Amino acid sequence: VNSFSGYLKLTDNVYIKNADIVEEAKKVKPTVVVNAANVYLKHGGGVAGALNKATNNAMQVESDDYIATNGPLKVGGSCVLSGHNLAKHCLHVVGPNVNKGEDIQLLKSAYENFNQHEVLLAPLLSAGIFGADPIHSLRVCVDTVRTNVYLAVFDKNLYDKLVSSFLE
Ligand SMILES: CC(C)[C@H](Nc1ncnc2[nH]c(C(=O)NC3CN(C)C3)cc12)c1ccc2c(c1)S(=O)(=O)CCC2
Question: Is the CB–ligand 1 distance for residue 51 below 6 Å?
Fold first, then answer.
């Protein structure tokens, strides 16, 4: 149904909210929820772990079956799989992990995958333990994505810092 509410409008197509992506998926019922995935689709912690746990492990079982036949994804790449009880589809997107030496330039490619979907619920790519500068990831999102993206950032201090820096 894509019933997003309580979001700050950053541009004509980019919205942001201090919220848990899992709780947003449950209320909004989006056509697409984006997962901050790794190349082998192992959803053990962070955003991936929260989405997988909200599907009672159905996402991980489906992901293991995909990996068995198709092998790993590439950094900057993506894969559409079922969204289970959280969405119609889950778009698993691999952003670069700069804390593991991955190229930050690939973050533009990661966001480009959002342009295949009219409207998406998404986390801020490569933030958290992936180590990218969150203000830079927001700028790559604004500059790259043309479709409607609703960003859920589950940290009030980070949300306030991003909004303040964007309004400069
Ligand atoms: C920046 C940070 C605040 C953000 N985290 C989140 N952003 C939006 N929704 C979220 N729900 C939960 C959660 O733990 N949800 C569970 C509580 N439980 C009730 C459900 C966390 C989270 C974030 C964004 C991107 C990435 C990461 C973290 S990561 O996982 O460290 C590496 C991958 C890239």
Answer: no
Pairing verdict, β 8-9 and 14-17: antiparallel
Cβ neighbors of 27 (< 8 A, separation 6 or more) are 3, 5
Q: What is residue 18's three-state secondary structure?
A: coil
**Residue-range domain boundaries for the chain:** 2-166
Resolution for the entry shown, Å: 1.5
Please tell me the experimental approach by which this structure was elucidated.
Answer: X-ray
Specify the 3-state DSSP secondary structure of 120. Answer: strand
Tell me which CATH code domain 2-166 carries: 3.40.220.10
Question: Radius of gyration (Cα) for the chain, nearest Å?
Answer: 15
Q: Does the beta carbon of 133 sit less than 6 angstroms from any atom of ligand 1?
A: no
Question: What is the C-alpha to C-alpha distance for residues 47 and 49, in angstroms, rounded to an integer?
Answer: 6
Distance of CA 37 to the CA centre of its chain: 8
Q: Separation of 1 CA from ligand 1 center, angstroms? A: 23
* Ligand 1 atom with minimal separation from the 126 CA: 34
**Cα–ligand 1 centroid distance for 115 (angstroms):** 22
